[model samples]
Target: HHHHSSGLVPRGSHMASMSQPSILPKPVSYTVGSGQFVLTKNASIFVAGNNVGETDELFNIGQALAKKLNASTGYTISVVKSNQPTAGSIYLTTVGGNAALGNEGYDLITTSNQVTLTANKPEGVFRGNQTLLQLLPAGIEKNTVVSGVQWVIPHSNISDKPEYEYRGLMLDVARHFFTVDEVKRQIDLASQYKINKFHMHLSDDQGWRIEIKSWPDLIEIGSKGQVGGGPGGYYTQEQFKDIVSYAAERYIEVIPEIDMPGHTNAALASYGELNPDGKRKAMRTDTAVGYSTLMPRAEITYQFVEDVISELAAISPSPYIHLGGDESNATSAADYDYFFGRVTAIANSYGKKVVGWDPSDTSSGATSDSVLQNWTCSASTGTAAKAKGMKVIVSPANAYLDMKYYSDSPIGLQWRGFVNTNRAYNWDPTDCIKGANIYGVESTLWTETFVTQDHLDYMLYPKLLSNAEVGWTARGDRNWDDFKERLIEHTPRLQNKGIKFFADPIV
Candidate 1:
């Protein structure tokens, strides 16, 4: 007969552990158990299902966990196909079309004998794997071997689901390029917090970062330089696809941004005819924003936009494509509307919904399907966008990762003034703008001053954690005091992953 401890078992026979594991975004509900399950060299992982797509994906997640355990514990954990779960085995399974688990929710039950992880989709299973890693010793995240540490997970039952469907991070590689490996590294880290979207700001005035097969010259001419005159780079179609694949494996959708009209200096330079004046000036390699605009009325300009959209949409499996319409200072309001009307139509024709920056809602030509990313600090910006009957992604400039943490910070911009970790965490997306329908939240990291991966790391941590919590936890469940306490515990985990985080509060 099965037994359960009331203190530890909330819904099943599994015992609650002595303490709750330090989990980010916290679980929807969980119980602490007094007993622990030890993972040994002889332990094997079983991925439950026939040789199908879902099973294969779960198998990869199992392999990743096994590899991490092997690296740190010096244990040879193997993936074996089993008809049923056995003692000392980790079982991964799925329920077909189950609404209980929702789209990306999961239920994890860890007992003394075996662990069962179940979810409705592959993404939920992957998130459960992440939770499993956290349940283990933090040192397991380290790349090198560690000796004399017993790997144990407390007996517990956890049911988890994100509050919002879209939890995102935007990395701007246009101002300064980051290598493919760097991007993969980021995906690995961000996925730990259950971030499901990786938004790549692929274009800006500084450079163009993705190849368009339709117009090869866009990359050839536009990719030669970056902000501050640094050598620029562009991803070949294969390379971009590789990134998309890498992110997909981690359950992260890659949303590519093609900034248009404004921030098109690189494109303008690439094709002289893109300018109404028929003049092709060399692309500027400076750290300035909003100085150029595409010739909205030019016939050739529409052709270029269509070609870029078609090529990018063909490569991207994501349903939404970002047609950046922010800071078009030089373009008249009428001209901006005309340009967006044509470009958005082209995107829609390719079966891609459009996402644009804050001011995008101001364009009368923008359709109801278009999403406005409100980045301005003022609540009025989001309210205005909401008034236009468009959805909003609350990404206020105040919480943006690219903003300097302090006036004396070694990197990042302070146009929005210094944004400390505390300030970044305290803002609630729902309260940021009244009467707005918020689809999700995103933290943007523009790389105008970021020159290295470490630079990126320092600006993202803690704040990123805060954003993840905001995106995943219920508004009533979110508490700054509790979050700060949990955040202190997570710093060691971040360190184990070799992240260079900001250690001091900026004044």
Candidate 2:
């Protein structure tokens, strides 16, 4: 039954041909070698330091591989762990002196006898796992088993790592609340591309998505409305924790955001004392900005800020909290300063750094310490953050996933111009603000125009691939022609996952 690209197929066998690895956000280095590691019914996944009788941290990693592949391949691939490496099995482990590979780097080696994935930590192994899966046929991702095809992985060695420490996708759930499952869905898909951060825009003028126990009325009265007058929902504390735990299992950090000052209508409507008039504004469901504001001079505002941040930080393991300091137009210039300064001070008191809209970096309140997100790149708001030595997260409006793909495209805004496939990928993150203390890149999906999972998939897939590539691949290793092909090859995996992505002309 030995097959060497033979034309005729033998019973229970076929021609096995190995091709170049088709991985997205391409690995740092991939060296091909002789032979192939064809997965079969007999193959088992082994975790180093895990023996047959007991288990270790890596055994869970081994289980993760088996759990995912078992459904599609219809193979009851047992995970052999806490044990030594075995022939004809896959291995995952960590080694000493791998500190140079950083916390998120991994090394993968494959041979006819075995395939081993080594990393500095379990998180790196999680990142490397996706690459290994892509080496197989795309059908490996389907839920239904397909016969007559060999699950073959070439014998190769790959060393991979991300270029930026933080690569993220921000979802504005406050605009149109995504349930815990929706958020988890995005996390599951994005994590495969090495997106380590899931930024949850939890509060805004229209709704509040997080449950602050001390302030139950906030969700009761404020979280009921969305932009299209839909009944928005809120995440209970346990539900939010569940999302966090699910993300942690995939090595993704969940960053929660609460819009401050101007976008504080939801808070103001819940607690009238925070408003200058001491009267609750009726729940706002329209798509408007910069109208409502909190009383910057009121002590009640600071107390509310402190209480919310305390509850949020207790649930989120991330070291940073987002006090959205965008579009505070109702607040006078001096009042804007007073409000941001007080809120930043409260966030700092809790031992958490703040992530603010672009102008927040220059706020007298932040003092060049907050991480700035540059939303409007084709404007005057770029120079100060870099000058102040704050770490800038470049999310130019041009790359906004909510922007329309072309004229007459259904369901997207064009305020930032048409962001087609090429526009989404061709630009460089550094080009937004030259010489800034650039931290990373994040592509925002404001839900003003997004209301469904299919909408998200349509906007995110091919375009998000570009953003992920920008965040993971080195500048020199990146080229449009090469990436376009990889993206085409990667779409089948997306289709198998039931994602409805845009059929851009780039193909």
Candidate 3:
């Protein structure tokens, strides 16, 4: 999935102008629900049984399916009361059973003349909608496109579940901010591939995003002050809200990470107290290696955390709040203890759970409910978090650093030991946390080195697909060889769509 063409383009244009699939299969008919396998030649599609109760979740699913069905073939599919489905006719319903996750769920279920989708949760129903979308013809028009042309969906029954329930990816835009259009583009790309979680690094040691209505200065000054790429911009509250709404439509939750305690150099620079000397200096936005650190013990730290998180929570409905608790510029033991207390209190008050990075014992501190991002090549912190009932997101560099280039950097920089497409394929998320049984895995795009959007796309592609499969398919169900085969099939699909993904071995 990572293989793609070079060069960057605007996000919306990229999606709209994506290459059309010329070799898609024709649509198929099915009779599902109530264990019926009869098909009838009907003028319009029929949906049987009471479309209530469990069908409440299917409320949207029906529409999503209708959209895809209408766009596919010439059949004017309609749904009405059909307790007894005719032979070969398709049936759609939301009954009580296990449905697929996102688009991958029902795709595994294929039969001669019957197809049924069931889910116990509303989220499952939502996923069913996506699965149906994936099953649609790749053509641009309704009812006029082909379905299984390029790839054939073999007749197989799939009873599968996710290996890790919490599959996610984090993007660090604070260091090198991406415009709103850019962020939305990534969201579309993630959704197109069934990634439900999009974690955004909004604030960092570099700059602050997400304008605070109460503290206009945070965005007016803090957002653009640091990075010298002209004035760094903050998403207006409206723009931020728009993105949230947009993601929701795609079943993607936007998790905003306001990196705290340590990576607050940008915030500290904006205001004096956060600095070591208790006085701030004018800041410029520079992706300098390290050195940007925030003092953990400053009193203003609470206000900053409280305000930024509250503002983000207002715009975002995600249950988790990420407090940038990763690399600190070396804080005293006492300061560490103090910082944890304030952060936890603030997070708890907002009715949101806090997520942090596992730092050294000297800097590590947070409650069990909080999620811990494990990036270091160690399992101690991850195990500790799980023991305390806290969830852990495993993003080990060895397994999931998407930004690390698989080929030589155009600038001739030292090799970062970045993994190749195959290396990403090598590691299995489920097996990696065998003992701890970590909640899930996430891939990170640290902007320490990358600048242009082209570089970002080059880094994400095939690797993102690996992470996606790790997150969605049951770990036991994964096969690297099979996935690689799928990647080969997926590359052209992405390329025709004008995506700029990396296309090389990560050696």
Candidate 4:
């Protein structure tokens, strides 16, 4: 994703006001005009221009908008496709291969009578729709009908795009189980920030969160409980497919992570033959990690790994599958290398790219196409991964959402010290690695303390928005003061969606 200015506003224009439109991950070029467009029961949506494979998706967006409007305001908004757009209708069009609107850039034009959105691809249209939704009153996102709230959108012309190709959020369900509905809700919220990747941490010592057809026991036995001995659950193949399909509609790719070698107690407990001692470990529901490892010398271990990956590959449409290679402390460096080499080959054999945590033992035959995820704060591992010709995804621990907002937070751990909202905001992805091909930025939310959707939202919001800004805004365009103001203005929008965010006077 590349940011391109359509000259809607003069170059270097930075005019803002207390009443200025509250747009998060600020658009590339925005020029506020006089007056506003009021959306009412009479408004309709239309699809214009040639059918470039975006007609259906764009229509879906229209239907979603109409449904949202009718549900929240009790106002019927007709949505249909037509060659001729009428007044008071929102027109969506795709102008493919336009240089101004890069790969995922869009131009949104709003007048008193109409709102026209044009993009080079369906992705751009989706992004434009997000901005359009934000332009309306924050109450538009309410689940039930809201009274006396005029759905007014200011007249503006904006062109927007993401600065990074991959803006991601990783949710760990293994530490605690989240139902399919919860994951879909998360997808809905994250996509509003133009996030395109939803990395699901599916397997860990505590539990496994996805079904593997080849290993029927993985979910049946492995997902019986979670950390603190709470009843855990897993998504069946059909449920997982539903999640992928739902995310894809919003242009978000679901990258599944099956933590390996170290976080393999769930697997080891389910499959006794894969362990070196050929013993079935007891079900672990504690927060402990790094005590498990698949026997590198055992053929059954490789077979187990291969079978799991093959099943996951068959179900996952994502090009990348994360073979978590983090903290295999019990395994020797040689064993780690050997295990990862085989794991990488297994993922490759199933026609999927491999993603592993940084500083993984790549000294042995790990595949060249493997992408390293740097979760540590230091730059050494990222640099090393780049040295090995692997692309790097920056996700330093300092930016982790699972960390406490402050030392006194009710939920979350503080091993990495206090990560306040501002602290989470004040980091650069490129600074983590000096001379590497960066895949993009991601924020990991481990669910050790997560018990409900509210707990998840309490830690996620505001900070997640910070990461979104980091991933979408260009380096030069970033400023703490500007972002804080924008964040303040955007808080009400989040509140409308019942999001609980960490906010302070200092920020």
Which digits, one per residue and each the tens of the lDDT, describe model 2 over residues 1-507?
A: 653311222341111111545698888999998899888888899776424322366778788789888878899988875447667788887754166678788998999988888887788888989898888788887778867778888999899888888889999998888878988999998998889998899999889889998888889988888888689999999999999999988988888999888788888888878777788888888888899888778888888889999999898888889888889888888888778878888888888989988677767877567888888765567577777788888898655988887787798888788886667777777778777777889989988888888888888877888888888888889887677667767767878888888866644
Question: Sorted by lDDT, highest first, which candidate order results?
Answer: 2, 1, 4, 3
Query: Over 4 Å off in model 3, which ranges?
Result: 1-57, 65-91, 99-115, 129-156, 225-230, 276-279, 293-295, 360-365, 411-416, 430-434, 505-507
Candidate 4 overall Cα lDDT vs. reference?
Answer: 0.81
Candidate 2, superposed: residue stretches over 4 Å from native? 1-20, 49-55, 96-98, 367-369, 378-384
Question: How do all models score by TM-score?
Answer: 0.92, 0.92, 0.78, 0.93
List candidate 4 segments past 4 Å from native.
Answer: 1-20, 361-363
C-alpha displacement of 248 in model 4, angstroms? 0.7
Top TM-score hit: 4
What is candidate 2's TM-score against the reference? 0.92
What Cα-based lDDT does every candidate model obtain?
0.81, 0.82, 0.59, 0.81
Give one digit per residue, the lDDT tens place, for model 3 in 1-507: 586532323342222332112211111122222222222224233343345553443444455555555554434555544545444544455444544343323322434455445444545545544544444324323335444433122243434345556667677777677788888877776665567777888877667777777677666667764444655667788988888887886777777887756666667666766566777756656655445555565566677778776877777788887876675556555775578657877888998887777752223456667777777646455666656666667776544454454345452122337565666655666444545547777878776555667767777775777777667665555566555545655555556445677665421
Model 4 clash count equals 0
lDDT by residue for model 4 (441-481), tens: 99889998998999989888878888888888887887777
Model 1: lDDT of residue 328:
94
Give, for candidate 1, the lowest lDDT window spanning 10 residues: 9-18
